[PDB]
Amino acid sequence: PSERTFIAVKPDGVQRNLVGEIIKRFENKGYKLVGLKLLQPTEEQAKQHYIDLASKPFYSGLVSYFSSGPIVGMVWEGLGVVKGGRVLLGATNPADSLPGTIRGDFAVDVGRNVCHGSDSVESAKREIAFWFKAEELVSWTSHSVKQIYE
Amino acid sequence: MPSERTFIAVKPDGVQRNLVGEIIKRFENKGYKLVGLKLLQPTEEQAKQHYIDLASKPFYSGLVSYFSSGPIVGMVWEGLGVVKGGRVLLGATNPADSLPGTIRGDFAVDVGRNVCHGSDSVESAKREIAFWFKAEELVSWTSHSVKQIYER
Amino acid sequence: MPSERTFIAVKPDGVQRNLVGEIIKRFENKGYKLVGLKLLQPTEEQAKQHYIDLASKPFYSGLVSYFSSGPIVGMVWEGLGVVKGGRVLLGATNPADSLPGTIRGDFAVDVGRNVCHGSDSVESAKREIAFWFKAEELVSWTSHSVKQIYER
Amino acid sequence: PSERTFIAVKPDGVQRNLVGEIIKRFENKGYKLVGLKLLQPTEEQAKQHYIDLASKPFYSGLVSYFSSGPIVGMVWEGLGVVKGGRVLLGATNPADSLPGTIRGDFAVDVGRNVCHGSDSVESAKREIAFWFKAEELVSWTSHSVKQIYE
Amino acid sequence: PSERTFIAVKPDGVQRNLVGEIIKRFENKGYKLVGLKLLQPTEEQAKQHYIDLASKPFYSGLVSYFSSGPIVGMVWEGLGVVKGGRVLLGATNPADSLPGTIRGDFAVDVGRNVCHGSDSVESAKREIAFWFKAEELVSWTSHSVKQIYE
Amino acid sequence: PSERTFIAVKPDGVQRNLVGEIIKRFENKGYKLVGLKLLQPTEEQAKQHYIDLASKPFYSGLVSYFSSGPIVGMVWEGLGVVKGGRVLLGATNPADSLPGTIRGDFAVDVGRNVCHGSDSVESAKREIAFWFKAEELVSWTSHSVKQIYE
Ligand SMILES: O=c1ccn([C@@H]2O[C@H](COP(=O)(O)OP(=O)(O)O)[C@@H](O)[C@H]2O)c(=O)[nH]1
Ligand SMILES: O=c1ccn([C@@H]2O[C@H](COP(=O)(O)OP(=O)(O)O)[C@@H](O)[C@H]2O)c(=O)[nH]1
Ligand SMILES: O=c1ccn([C@@H]2O[C@H](COP(=O)(O)OP(=O)(O)O)[C@@H](O)[C@H]2O)c(=O)[nH]1
Ligand SMILES: O=c1ccn([C@@H]2O[C@H](COP(=O)(O)OP(=O)(O)O)[C@@H](O)[C@H]2O)c(=O)[nH]1
Ligand SMILES: O=c1ccn([C@@H]2O[C@H](COP(=O)(O)OP(=O)(O)O)[C@@H](O)[C@H]2O)c(=O)[nH]1
Ligand SMILES: O=c1ccn([C@@H]2O[C@H](COP(=O)(O)OP(=O)(O)O)[C@@H](O)[C@H]2O)c(=O)[nH]1
Ligand SMILES: [Mg+2]
Ligand SMILES: [Mg+2]
Numbered sequence: 059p060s061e062r063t064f065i066a067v068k069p070d071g072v073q074r075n076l077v078g079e080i081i082k083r084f085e086n087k088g089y090k091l092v093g094l095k096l097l098q099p100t101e102e103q104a105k106q107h108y109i110d111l112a113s114k115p116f117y118s119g120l121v122s123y124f125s126s127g128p129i130v131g132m133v134w135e136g137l138g139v140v141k142g143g144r145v146l147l148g149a150t151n152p153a154d155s156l157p158g159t160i161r162g163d164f165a166v167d168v169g170r171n172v173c174h175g176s177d178s179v180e181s182a183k184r185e186i187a188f189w190f191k192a193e194e195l196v197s198w199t200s201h202s203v204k205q206i207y208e
Numbered sequence: 209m210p211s212e213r214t215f216i217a218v219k220p221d222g223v224q225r226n227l228v229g230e231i232i233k234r235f236e237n238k239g240y241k242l243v244g245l246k247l248l249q250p251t252e253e254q255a256k257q258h259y260i261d262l263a264s265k266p267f268y269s270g271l272v273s274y275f276s277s278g279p280i281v282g283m284v285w286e287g288l289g290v291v292k293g294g295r296v297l298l299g300a301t302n303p304a305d306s307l308p309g310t311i312r313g314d315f316a317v318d319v320g321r322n323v324c325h326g327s328d329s330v331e332s333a334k335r336e337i338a339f340w341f342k343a344e345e346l347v348s349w350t351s352h353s354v355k356q357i358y359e360r
Numbered sequence: 361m362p363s364e365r366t367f368i369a370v371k372p373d374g375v376q377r378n379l380v381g382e383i384i385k386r387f388e389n390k391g392y393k394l395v396g397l398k399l400l401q402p403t404e405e406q407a408k409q410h411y412i413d414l415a416s417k418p419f420y421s422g423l424v425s426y427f428s429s430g431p432i433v434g435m436v437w438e439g440l441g442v443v444k445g446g447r448v449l450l451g452a453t454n455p456a457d458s459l460p461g462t463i464r465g466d467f468a469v470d471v472g473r474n475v476c477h478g479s480d481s482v483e484s485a486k487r488e489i490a491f492w493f494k495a496e497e498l499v500s501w502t503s504h505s506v507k508q509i510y511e512r
Numbered sequence: 513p514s515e516r517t518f519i520a521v522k523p524d525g526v527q528r529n530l531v532g533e534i535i536k537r538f539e540n541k542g543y544k545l546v547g548l549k550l551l552q553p554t555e556e557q558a559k560q561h562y563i564d565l566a567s568k569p570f571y572s573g574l575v576s577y578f579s580s581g582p583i584v585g586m587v588w589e590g591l592g593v594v595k596g597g598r599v600l601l602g603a604t605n606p607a608d609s610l611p612g613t614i615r616g617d618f619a620v621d622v623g624r625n626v627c628h629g630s631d632s633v634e635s636a637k638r639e640i641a642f643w644f645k646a647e648e649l650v651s652w653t654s655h656s657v658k659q660i661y662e
Numbered sequence: 663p664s665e666r667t668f669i670a671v672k673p674d675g676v677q678r679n680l681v682g683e684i685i686k687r688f689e690n691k692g693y694k695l696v697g698l699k700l701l702q703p704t705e706e707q708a709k710q711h712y713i714d715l716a717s718k719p720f721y722s723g724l725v726s727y728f729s730s731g732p733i734v735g736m737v738w739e740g741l742g743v744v745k746g747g748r749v750l751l752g753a754t755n756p757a758d759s760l761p762g763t764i765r766g767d768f769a770v771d772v773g774r775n776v777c778h779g780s781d782s783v784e785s786a787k788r789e790i791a792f793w794f795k796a797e798e799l800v801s802w803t804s805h806s807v808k809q810i811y812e
Numbered sequence: 813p814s815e816r817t818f819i820a821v822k823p824d825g826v827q828r829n830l831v832g833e834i835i836k837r838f839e840n841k842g843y844k845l846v847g848l849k850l851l852q853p854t855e856e857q858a859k860q861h862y863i864d865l866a867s868k869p870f871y872s873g874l875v876s877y878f879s880s881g882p883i884v885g886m887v888w889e890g891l892g893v894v895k896g897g898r899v900l901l902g903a904t905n906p907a908d909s910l911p912g913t914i915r916g917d918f919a920v921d922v923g924r925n926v927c928h929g930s931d932s933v934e935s936a937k938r939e940i941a942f943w944f945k946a947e948e949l950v951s952w953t954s955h956s957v958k959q960i961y962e
């Protein structure tokens with residue numbers, strides 16, 4: 059249950075007032091919020107975030123958009139939260155996302171897909187370390203932990 | 209193209225069960241743009257033409273009668289992939305097969321009371337839109353959120 | 361009488377901000393019956409007539425221009441006390457004075473972008489309904505829930 | 513349309529304030545509520561309810577947890593309600609449950625999966641008879657029945 | 663915080679699928695559910711429930727309607743729950759009820775006002791005793807009690 | 813419209829999973845999020861934040877509780893946001909709060925009233941400066957600003 063993942067509301071998600079909605083879905087699921095911030099990514103930060111896509115033709119547009127305004131960065135904790143977080147978000151391409159998921163309910167275009175979630179335990183650890191300083195994470199015990207976990 | 213359009217209807221059961229606002233909200237929340245909207249009472253002949261492809265099916269008479277038994281809300285929605293995407297929002301035709309999160313998955317039980325309709329293709333959408341709406345009844349406008357919803 | 365009617369509009373800001381479904385849902389949830397619905401683009405002259413009582417006010421030109429700047433959704437709702445009750449659902453005219461739970465209390469900040477309109481009396485409702493809707497555009501039907509909502 | 517199923521909010525679901533939410537989803541779907549009660553299962557009741565799983569390694573924990581606090585028992589009536597009720601709940605193991613379902617939206621751990629639904633017409637009849645006395649079930653007609661059923 | 667009140671969803675509220683919604687609002691507020699049942703009031707029970715209105719001209723209609731189909735009876739526990747429960751319901755006459763309340767959001771007619779709440783500590787105790795047997799109430803501790811109460 | 817206020821989800825609000833809900837209400841209203849973070853107040857921080865109430869008999873309990881676990885701090889921007897933010901929260905004492913407001917919907921006890929909002933333009937400026945560093949606030953333009961403001 060101490061697994062952690064990085065979830066972000068992308069600039070489109072902030073602009074379209076989906077921050078609270080996204081946070082609510084993670085809270086409702088049983089996951090625990092241990093880091094939260096609002097920040098405007100720099101271009102260098104955007105380049106790193108999208109580094110796997112550096113050779114794609116839409117990279118420069120993605121990097122520019124991701125650094126064009128604020129995101130909300132989050133760290134969530136819970137059993138299977140990396141994979142579970144992504145299930146909440148829905149398929150990467152909103153054409154594939156199902157209703158009930160964040161992208162299924164709210165997104166149409168793969169380049170404006172509202173949010174991001176780490177794709178593995180390892181990439182989660184890297185992303186958390188990239189976006190948050192040690193002193194910015196909060197460790198606490200949910201009063202509901204024994205209701206959510208056996 | 210983001211200028212694709214589809215026809216969505218709330219069927220008489222959906223109107224009677226107060227699902228009009230809920231259905232509209234889901235389409236708005238998705239990012240689709242409302243360009244036509246009206247409340248109307250279909251005639252039996254209108255229902256027959258709308259469902260003409262299904263004239264030989266055993267449920268046709270019942271469908272036609274029910275569709276014309278009270279008001280529907282007709283809508284035209286605009287957006288990238290909206291024909292296919294609209295139907296995904298509605299859920300499987302038979303509510304037994306619809307998933308929670310979809311309109312039929314959340315709100316319907318019986319295939320003959322499945323709350324709503326969506327065009328099944330670009331071509332049938334164009335026909336349905338022209339059938340239910342006059343040219344002057346559609347409204348062209350630009351969503352202030354278009355650049356937040358679409359990359360181009 | 362339960363056959364009282366009022367005109368409610370989602371103003372251009374309400375349409376742009378995706379509040380059409382939300383507003384309709386609140387009226388459906390309350391028990392009111394939808395008997396007219398359309399999306400339309402008011403003209404400046406239509407906006408001037410609709411707000412004619414306010415011609416001398418300093419905000420009139422701005423109001424008229426804004427009301428005609430993009431689509432509205434016009435509605436006719438039917439029910440006991442619906443004129444007064446509809447306005448209660450909308451909340452105080454100036455959103456600074458609107459309470460949470462109302463449409464303006466939950467969703468609006470500025471009196472000039474207050475999301476919606478409702479007729480202020482039985483008489484002005486009748487005038488507004490006749491102004492925005494033709495006779496053939498209203499739909500008369502019976503809600504299957506009328507005896508659950510009304511004692512008589 | 514007179515098929516019936518037994519649905520329970522398990523002790524974790526009651527503790528986490530999901531009773532209203534779960535009822536709402538069944539009402540919204542078109543199913544009819546014909547029995548409803550809050551009760552504290554005994555250990556012996558839990559054992560019988562789960563008797564088919566007596567040999568499974570999680571049985572003792574399940575039986576103990578199911579009897580650890582109040583549940584809300586329900587009987588719902590409608591066409592295909594046994595199978596349809598389970599679709600609303602979502603897969604048994606929340607790791608497999610999809611967003612939009614009760615367990616997909618609200619649960620993380622298979623041992624804290626919020627709710628129960630009968631798995632067949634036959635087991636539904638048994639469970640209903642087990643949890644409810646005849647006088648606790650109400651026969652009535654929904655004024656919306658012709659809007660929900662052809 | 664051990665104050666208790668009787669809340670009912672009237673037959674109109676059940677018929678119009680407002681049970682879950684009403685329960686959710688009480689759960690969300692922080693109140694604790696200690697009794698719940700679905701039942702069809704008898705005519706004699708309706709007469710007692712409306713006894714203060716015996717001389718009013720609409721009494722016989724009220725008594726008939728209240729005994730025409732199921733209600734959901736509830737007992738809720740919490741600090742100030744009698745008065746607080748009524749605030750959630752809204753003013754008795756829906757013409758006076760404010761949006762945000764149950765009647766403000768969902769009712770139009772004073773004779774079809776969806777729900778009932780006890781009007782005092784004393785009338786609560788009487789109503790609870792009238793609608794529930796001792797063995798039907800469940801005493802339990804919400805895992806959230808220290809989050810809701812100082 | 814550039815007025816700003818400080819809003820906090822108090823430790824009880826975070827524990828009870830009301831962060832998303834509270835953010836959603838502010839987003840829905842039309843206010844703009846310009847600062848957001850999760851943090852654990854220290855006792856000294858709580859004391860300074862509530863310094864005007866040092867002589868009141870509940871002070872020591874308030875200071876201790878406010879520093880007992882994480883809060884979510886927020887800065888919101890908009891016309892009349894200081895006064896308007898407080899209207900969204902509801903009266904200080906939940907007994908007085910109306911349904912529709914955060915405390916009206918979710919709180920029972922004045923010592924567990926879920927959230928905080930600055931009480932004036934001047935106290936807002938102080939609180940913002942106290943909880944947020946300059947680099948933690950983001951200056952951006954909502955694409956919806958002309959739809960919300962005349
Ligand atoms: O063909 C593509 C593929 C990806 N993306 C964007 O690039 C992001 C990161 O791509 P990745 O393959 O990492 O998807 P994710 O990990 O977000 O599912 C996605 O979320 C998309 O917004 C895009 O615009 N076009
Ligand atoms: O066995 C069936 C199949 C379909 N329908 C109804 O006929 C409509 C049109 O059927 P179609 O195959 O066009 O499905 P849709 O395009 O609505 O998914 C459906 O929406 C159903 O309401 C029915 O009553 N019985
Ligand atoms: O000082 C004002 C008063 C009113 N209005 C606008 O004018 C409309 C009509 O004003 P009226 O007094 O008719 O209020 P309503 O009937 O809409 O409550 C309102 O809805 C506002 O949008 C404005 O912009 N400034
Ligand atoms: O590996 C498992 C499988 C099941 N269960 C629990 O045992 C219950 C009954 O199992 P069953 O196969 O009957 O699932 P259900 O009928 O609830 O879908 C489930 O709901 C779970 O709470 C568990 O703790 N571990
Ligand atoms: O003029 C009236 C007054 C009351 N009632 C009904 O009688 C119930 C009980 O009346 P009471 O004065 O006890 O109101 P409550 O205690 O429910 O607020 C109300 O909830 C109404 O539904 C009515 O039909 N007409
Ligand atoms: O009798 C009281 C009054 C206030 N408070 C707490 O002290 C906080 C600050 O009091 P203030 O008068 O500043 O209220 P606020 O500014 O939060 O409305 C409140 O929010 C309550 O949590 C309390 O515990 N008991
Ligand atoms: Mg990725
Ligand atoms: Mg078809």
Ligand SMILES: [Mg+2]
Pocket residue numbers: 478479480
């Ligand atoms: Mg007016």
Ligand SMILES: [Mg+2]
Pocket residue numbers: 629631
């Ligand atoms: Mg089973």
Ligand SMILES: [Mg+2]
Pocket residue numbers: 779780781
């Ligand atoms: Mg009374």
Ligand SMILES: [Mg+2]
Pocket residue numbers: 929931
């Ligand atoms: Mg203060």
